[model samples]
Every structure is written in structure tokens, then in C-alpha cells.
Target chain A: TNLCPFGEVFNATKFPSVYAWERKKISNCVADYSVLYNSTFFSTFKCYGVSATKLNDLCFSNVYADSFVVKGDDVRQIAPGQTGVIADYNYKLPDDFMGCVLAWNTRNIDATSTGNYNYKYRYLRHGKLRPFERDISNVPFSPDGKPCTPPALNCYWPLNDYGFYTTTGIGYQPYRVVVLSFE
Target chain B: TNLCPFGEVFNATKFPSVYAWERKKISNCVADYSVLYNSTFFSTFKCYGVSATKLNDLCFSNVYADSFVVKGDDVRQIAPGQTGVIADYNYKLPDDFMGCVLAWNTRNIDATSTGNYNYKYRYLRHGKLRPFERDISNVPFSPDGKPCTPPALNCYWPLNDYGFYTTTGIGYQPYRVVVLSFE
Candidate 1:
């Protein structure tokens, strides 16, 4: 059993080896914005995807729990056994709504903050599991936790273990991203 | 049937979109050095192994050969029935030799040279299909072949198009690059 951070047991024997990023965030927060920035920092995980982005209540700011409205093509449901690929679907945005995650060279610029951050999403049939210098905790810092060094980033990411978050700073956010546990 | 630059006949129905680039050299003088460049380029392509680089000969100095070398890893046989990709292999020596094309942010570069300008042998793939804003003829020059157009170095080649040459002359160095026809 590989000690992946999330305890996300991926039996290499059955699965062709896929690394996915599952998140459960409110649609209002990251509508049209790539919620996850760290995914781009890693390259080992060939196929990566996030769950429903329409969980936010931004469209209906006045109404609380507005029953997650999945705007035009916002809900990208992969067929049974099909991977959640950002490339398969042709993104269509509605006139009044904004909900979509791009599948390539996406940057994250906080409306309320400042910093140049982004990620590159690619769709590949096979996962060329290279080394990834990532620690889930790197972005979403963990307190009382020793800052564990992650693998290096760039063309080839360094591989420490899989599925573990280490602290980088106190101001870092938590794992707000929801993942689709494709059981 | 549509008219392509290479004088190759294409059946709009049977071969609706036919594209091919045969390997050819400018002259024997340029062939010797470019051939060695091709050989070195192939060494890197082969080093990436059959799995890494799936293109044939990284460099082809052929002055009109049936097949051109596909510069990259693998050196796979891109003969009939192969359907994947065609790319131009640019040996941006020192830098490219140590890294892959992905390392370079933009595909096109300003071919604005002055004085004893030099460039490594760039291998072309993908049937000579050029990227946007790049024209071989109008490269950093005007119709009369003068640097009158000034400022814009002209040849803003796309990601994969045209090989390279390291001399202070107009046009591609002979025996340095060739068109590779992909099915």
C-alpha cells in the first residue's frame, strides 16, 4: 500500500495508474476560475480533474443554499468508468452564468489578493507517472505540522510519497478542493 | 483535391486532408555539417528511446528523399496509417540539447539577425505545417528580401515548423531540414 497523502489507495494492479484531484467547494467561490493551483505544480499525475464546480451559491447570492445551480455545461459528468477529462467536453458558458475550468495553461489571480499563480492542465490517455514535488499541505498549510520538504517542481517533478499535506505557512488555506472518489 | 505547396496530389474524398514534406537538401556543402547535426539530434531522439520520442530521424539532410527524419524521441516509424502528430525538431543547441521543446515557452522566434549571426540546425517535422504569424519567405524581410520592414524580426514560427540553420544567409540552410509527411 503506497502511503499516498489522502490515504487514497490506488491499487496499481487494477487501475492503469491515475492521479486525480477531488474537491468539494462552493460553486460561487471558483466559478470560471481554476480553484486548484497546485495541480499544475506536479507532472507525475497525468490525468487530473476536479468535481462539480456548481456547488457554489454565487448566482443566487440572496438565497442561501440555492440548490447548487449547474450553469450551462457547468456539470461535466464523465460516463461510467470514464475519466473526468477537461478536454472531452466543449466548454459552453451561459450569458448570465460563469462556471468552467479550463484544461490548459490556466492562471490564478485572486480578485482580492495579488500574486501571479497558474497551472497547466493537459489531457493524456496514459499517465507518465514522473516525479512530482508536491505536498498537499504546501499550499494549504497545516499547523502543528513540521514543514516536510516536497519534491522539486518544473519539467520533471520530484517524488516524495503520495497523499500528504505539509505546512508552508500559517496563512495558507486548507484542502478546500473536493475530489471525486471514483470508487 | 486541394493544392498543397509540395506539388503532391490529394484526393478530397479518399485523402481529404493530405499533407506531406519530403526530405531534401540545399547543397552538398551544407549537408555535411547538417548531417552531423542530424546525427547528434538523432542521438538525443534515440536517447529518449522508442517510448519517449516516437518520431523518426531527428535530423534529415536529404535533398529530396522519400522519407524525412522525425526529430524527437522514439524515432518511431511514421509511415502509412500512423495517426498522431508531426513536429519540427529545433536543435537550439546547449539549451534544447539539455531540454525538451516544452521548456521553451513560445514556439516562434524572431529570425532577426545582424552581423555574423548563427543558429543551430533546426529539424522540421509535421509536414512543414507552420504556426501562426510565421512565413518562411517573408522572414524578417520584405517581398524584395530586404530588412526594410524593420523591427519585427518577421519569422514568428509557430510551435512546430521549419528546421534551423547556423549561417549568415537568407533562407534555410540546405541539408539541415526536410518535410516529413505524416498520415
Candidate 2:
């Protein structure tokens, strides 16, 4: 069911304040992050260590349905407070919180729900993999020090942990945005 | 120089309490993540869909130095508190954080430093690309509510945003572990 190649393209019309980023890392060769895109209308998440022709960026720039075994390349749209995974969208991180984000869920971040601490503001993520690998996950959390219950997410890790603890290696850029895709 | 294939295998003696994960997502296709690996001695960030021959999983199982333009098969080892990128090492996600992790740095997340919020505990990550794509990042942060300065890590995003809002789309599992490699 692979439709389009999963690559982010700037919709300049929607986000005029943000700069359009090169899908490819155009220059950085040593490597800093995986691919490049924007997190908010004001900030852009660009690749550092040579994206385009690089291995990870190839995951972006190319239409290799079989390359990474990812069969689809479409993001689905979601309504506010939806309990589902939102593909191909990323919001902003808490200020000064350098971490990895897998996907986004809701833009409203409805923490007002009775006994709910932003469960409606859910996203997908992953954490350590034994001592070497990592996988995608979905867990709820709150950056404002609220008690998050149910459907946990893997957001942070420390140095020296196995998949023992990590990033693609680039620092996290914080901002907020929302989108959707279908697969 | 490319040394290893960048997959996690159980060093049985080193981590006896942990279980080994199938480098390949032998089953569960339809996808929940980019790849699968263990997160800690008890938790495992296994891929939801079939990983092994899948596109994203292929990036892990096969040695596609040129497939993804990766060009390397190694992970550099580091000391307790060194500032560097630890290629191919994913650690445990913070509890209840549905997020993604890139690599690990040091086991000694020493808050004992004069004024450091685990700067020695750094890894790479990316939040959202512009409206375009996401890249590998290396921002530093801590889930325990510490004063994270000097980093600029990109960690979370939401649905309906471009790069537009989120994941490989699996829920995040949390745990802890540590390791290192070189590329």
C-alpha cells in the first residue's frame, strides 16, 4: 500500500514565517541528524551530516518502498482530541528539552479533559531497545509537570544507555506544527 | 571504517537479565515503527509490523551502505562523560514518553557537574523539518525536569502538522539500557 515517498515539503502558503528547508542536507557531510523538515512555522528542522545522498536521508529523498520496508508514504489528517496516530506530523518540544519525537497526534493538547493530562495531545515515539536498537511507540506525557496516565510514550534517554540509552545525534529544535498522512 | 552491521545482538554475558529481540520484525506487518530493538533489560522496543525485509527495517537488517547511502557499518565507543556522537546506539525512553531516540552517549549521567543538566549525557534527535522533512538531531534534555541549557534538542510534535505533525506510528515503550559503537 505504498503511495508516495515519505518526504516533507514546505507549504510556504501556510507557514510564511518559516523558511523552506532543503529536503536534502545539501552540504553537511560528517552527519548530525537524519532528514530535514520544519517543526513550526518559525523554525525548521534541517539535516546536518549530509542528508540527500546519505543513508538516512535516502530514506527521505528516494522512493524506495522496499529500501526501508516502509510500504506507504501518506499522512492522515486527524481532528482535535483524537485517540490515534498522526503520521508525518511533528509539533514543538518543551523549551530546553532536547529529545526525539516520533509522530504527533493532536494539536489542541487538551489537558482540560477531566482526569486527563493531555492524553488527547498524544504522539508516537520510541526509546531504548535492549542495549542496541529502538522501535516506535505511543505514550502520553506532559511537559508542564502534570501526572500523565495510560498510553505511555518514550521521549528521553541519557548517554551510554543501549538504543543503551540516544538520537540520530543532532540536537532537538523546538517549535510547534501539526499535519497528517495516510498509509 | 565500517565495522559492524549496526544491529543489536545479545551479549548474553553482559546483559543476562534481558531477552534477545529478533533483529527482524519477523511478524506484525502494517507497521508500528521504523525498526525494532530492545530498550532495557526488561523492556524491548520491538517493531510492530514486519521489520526484517520491510523498507525501514531493511535499513537495519541489511548492510545498505549505499542502499540508504549510509556507507558505514559501525558504532564508536565512548567514555563516561565524553561529548561526541555514539552512532547506532538507542537508549531507553523516559517513562511514559511516546517519543523517538537516536543514540546514546555515557552511562554516567552525572548531575554532580557544576552546572550541567547532563550535557555529558547527550544524544542526537530531530523534531520536525520545515514544512519539509525531519533530520537527525543532537540536542540535550532530561525527562526529570532539569534545567537543560546549551543544547537545543528537538523532541516532540503533534498530528496534522506538516513533516506535518508525527511517527513510524507505534506507541512508545519505556525502559533503560546503555551501549556504544563507532562508524
Candidate 3:
């Protein structure tokens, strides 16, 4: 039986935009990114959040002998690369969390002359969330002036026609709640 | 005016029992420890939790422009010494937290050969919360075996009589919660 909370899987739907979204969402909460992907490719990755305390009278009540939950009082000062899981299961996104891309699909982009580009997404910068949408140029071209590849195309949403679309609303991102409890 | 939520002040009551309570209370949620102290003096400390996500249909229904809260979707990859806060306040103990000191007071000890001996408390050894109370002798001495000083007496409760007490039931600890909206 899967004993502990499930580690969540986050998929980056688009590049540039997805990068900022993924970065911002994970940073805002006490969840670690156990696994990361760039267009179906597994990226060996690790991330951690400062953690403590157990959930109570709310959701996931009752601790099983084999499985323990993260309580509110448990403050864990982890070293870098420390493993985060309860029992064997990784804590996952809370049930109430919604999708980010579906909510606000915009990110900042600055194309390089060499066909390379940089992307920026803002959330909780200096303890405050910033705007998602930014200025976009009508002409989208790869650095070498060649057609975008499949990965490049998916990574840079602005390279496509849809790049013109922007939203005034905020977007959604994934985060984890539990820091593994070891007594 | 106390416009923001009041972060709680925790008092360390017993030795072994007190360690467990503090550890358990902080584990359940993402809150920071802003201050630390021994019995004789208070120390300045700053800590943050891996954090994100707005609370749902629960506490702190709205976010004011001046006081924007962090939500689940914001993911921040932090380096050592990164900081997090509870809206310019030390994150409070979550509401659902339960107590620990009252639950486990009994710990083994060896009384000292001298009248004044010292006690040591360590939890999680680096990252883990370990037992605070240890074997004690009849006489209480500093670790060096000199008569325990005034600081030693206040720091170790077992030097007095109550060190013998333990409990069977659960107690509550304090914590904080908030809701989020994306726009």
C-alpha cells in the first residue's frame, strides 16, 4: 500500500512562460520539487522548503501506525539535498490547488540576438507577487533565424501566434505542504 | 493596532517533554521561528518555512493591498539563509497545532555525585528533534561537575522535583493560516 502522501507531478506546458510559472509556484510554499521535466525529459532536480507543524481538525486526520503526517509544531532544519518524504510517500499538492497555465498563461520574455532567449515569471519577489504579462514584439524569430524546433517552439510560447495573448489575472502554480516527519 | 495576526510566544516548560512539544508543533505547517532563548537570556533569531498557497475558505478571507499574503502557486528555490516572513510578522503557530510537553515529560536521568550538575538538551541532532531530558543523578552539577549555577537551575527543571512527572494524553500547540486569490 502507498503509505504516505503522494509526491506531486508538475508538467511545464510551455517554455519561457512555463519556466517562470514553475519557479514562482514552487518558491511560494513549503514544498520541494522532487522531480522536474523539460518537455517529457526528466531533469535530475532537487528542491526543499523550510518546514514544520502538523495538519489538524482539518484534512487528513488520524495517523496510521505505518504512516505519519506532518504536524504544525515540527520545525525541520534540513541540510541541502536532504530527502523529503513521509514513510515512503512524498507529500503532494493540496486538493484545493488549481492549475497555473489554465489560470494565467503569461510570462516575460527577452529574445537574444543569437536566437537564444531568456524568460522571467514573477511571484513573491521580495515577499510580493509581481505582474505576469510583459511587452511582446510582433516578430518572433530563433537566434539563428531558422524555424523553431519542436522543443524550442513548445518552450517559447511567444514564438507562436498565441504569444500575443495576455491576461490581467494571476496564474496558478504547484507547491507541496508536507515536510517529512521523522521521530 | 494589531492589524496583522499575532504570532505566538512559546515557553519551554520541561526538559525532554518540552523538546518534543516544540518540535511537533512546528512540523505541521510553514511558519518561521523568529526568536530563540535559553532560560537566562533571549537570543535574536530569524527563520523561515518552505511556503506557498493561500488558505482556502478558511481563515483570513481577504488580502489587503498593503498586506499581500503568499499563496501555494508561488515556488521559490532558495539558498541557505533565505528568508520568509508572516506579513512583516513572524509566522504564527498554525491554528491546528497540538502541544508536546504535556504528552512526554518522563525521560531517564542520572543524578550527579555533586550537589550541582548540568543538563543538556538536543532534538533532531542537526535536523531532527531529539529528547531534551536525560539521565540525572541526585546531585545537580554543571557538566564540569562544579555546583550548578543560577543559570543551570533555571535551565534544567529536573534539578527540582517535577522532573518525575509524565502524561498520557495529547495537548494543543498554536499555528497560523491564510487564504489566497489570483487576479
Candidate 4:
């Protein structure tokens, strides 16, 4: 009921070999991911893939009809064991979308590694909303590497130690297409 | 620029019937539209085919020497009339972008005769954040003439003069496909 603009298209004739991707095989998975928006896991997800659907070529799998308030032309397609839900709906963050984000891709990063991991997660939202700005690495040091800075302790507020103690490697996982609308 | 992040995959194989369009035609008479994002406007002129191609079947043309950015993914098709450049400067605007609009096809009108004649135009957004607002009016005029609104105004409130508007009839010239980011 979130405006219900939910959508789906991806049918590039059911995966028409973009060279025939294959991270682990959700078919072949050369690389195709999308989730263009989502206030913040709107309910669990927002929007991804803007538009995808081909025939004489290849790429198939589309679904839409369950939105909470997700738009941007709704589309879905992210090979390799697809996992979609662009915007489910819970929406809270809306103040010009401070550091607005929800990125993903897990293993084929581009656009300059998602713009240097979105400038290191906007420096952990500036040390989690100015926890006295910065004195230099606001949290813990080593023992395992967690604190970063400010009240953001774990490993010097590096976006909560890279969004909560690192985990973006094996195949690089980030299939998310986009989701920054801000105010 | 809509902030710009990444959305360049153009070349629209000279408008492969406009990204594999199927609607065919909507001809009524008189037309000439323009909206280039990364370069690929090979000349067709006088549009009225009811307008489709909203984020479609892969239409990326090409003109790369070193390639700074010309996309749909480096479009490449030039024959029809030959001029090139339908894609214009990727500024990424797909919170679910749905822009492929092109109406201008009115003759006598249908849907019982669209009241007295209004046609619909609403484009606004001119780019650099002018987006005034309020332009709806697809069918909204209920004093009890019949049509009211909500066939598909979609949603959003930015490009001024009441956001965005389009209804199409008399010289029927509707145009839109702005859902830039969704899932």
C-alpha cells in the first residue's frame, strides 16, 4: 500500500550472455544487479534495477506488485541467487537523507568502488552525527579492530567499522543499483 | 544532473523501433520532440507513436575514442536519417526514472471526447533543479463530467508549476518515463 508502484521487468531473453556472467551461477551471473531506492530497508528493501527486460537477446525474471512506497520506475534483476525487495516500508530517515545510503554489490564493485564505499560511509555519518567531530579514530584500536571514533566505538568510526565489523569480500557482494533521493 | 551517480547505457541502435517498441503508432499529426541525455538522436522527427521506450530493450549507440562517457553503455547505430546523439550527459535521475515520453498525437480525441479539449503538456524540470511542482490533471476535474484523476499520475512533487502535468488529447502530446530508481 506504499503507493503500490511495485514493478519488475528483467527478461533480456532470460540471460543473454553479457559474456555469460557467473559469480556462483544464478544462471551464469556475469553481473546484473539493481535496487535503485529504499529510504532504509523501507520495510526490508526499497528499489533496485531501474529497467530490464529483453527478448531477442536474453535475460528473464520480473516481479512487481507489492510496494509500500517505492518508486523510481520499479525494476528488478540481479543475477546470482537473486534477492530482491527494494523497499518494504518503515521509513524514518528523511532529513535531506543524511548520508543517505544502503549500497550493496558483494563482488563486482565499480563506479569507483561505489565511490570509495561512499566516502567511507560518509565517515560514519560524521562520527555518528558529530560525536564531537573527531579526535582521530574515535573508538577501539585492535584486539580485533572494531572501534573507530566518537560514540561510534568498535574501530575508529569507519562507518561502524565498515558498516559493522567488515564483511564485504567473497565475490564482493553488492548487487544494489541505487537508492539516494534525499529531501 | 539529479545528483548524478551512474546511468549511462545509451546507443539506442538508432531507436530500434524505440527499444523494441510494440505500441506501433498513434499518429494524428504534427510533432517534434527533443530530450538527449548521452547522445543518440538520429532524426525521426514528428513523434506520435503514442510514446513508449521507457528504459528498454538495450539501445546503446557509440562514438568512443577514449570514452569519457556517452552511454546506454556506449550506444552505436546511425542510418535512419543520420545525425546521432540521443543520449545526453549522464546525470543519473532514476529514483525510478520513467522518461521516454513523446505524445503530440491529437486528432478528434476519444475516451468519450475529453471534455472540451485541453491536450496536456507538463514538462518543467528543465534540469538544474527548477522543479516547481503541481501539473497532474490526467483526468481530474470532477464536477461530474466523468473523468477525475488517478489513471496514472504516478507520483512525485518537485518540478514546479504544480510539479508535473500531462493529459494528452487535442494535439495529444504526452511524454514521460521518469522512474529512474526502483527495484
DockQ of all models, two decimals each: 0.01, 0.02, 0.04, 0.01
Candidate 4: segments with Cα more than 4 A from true spot? A1-155, A161-175, A178-183, B1-56, B59-142, B145-183
**Chain A of candidate 2 scores what in TM-score?**
0.21
Residue lDDT tens for model 1, B16-93: 111232222222322123112111111111111111111112222222222222322212222211224433232111
Candidate 3 chain B: worst-modelled 10 consecutive residues by lDDT? B97-106
The predicted structure with the larger DockQ, 3 or 4, is 3
Q: Highest DockQ: which candidate?
A: 3
* Model 3 C-alpha lDDT per residue in residues A128-156, reported as the tens digit of each score: 11122122232333545555544555223
TM per candidate, chain B: 0.19, 0.21, 0.18, 0.17
* Model 3: CA > 4 A from native: A1-9, A18-183, B1-17, B20-141, B145-183
Per-residue lDDT value at A53 in model 4: 21
Candidate 1's displacement at residue B129, Å, is: 12
What is the docking quality class of candidate 1? incorrect
* lDDT, residue B109, model 3: 26
Model 1 Cα lDDT, one tens digit per residue, A24-131: 323222122122222322111111221112211112121111011111121232111232332221111222222222111112211114421221122322222222
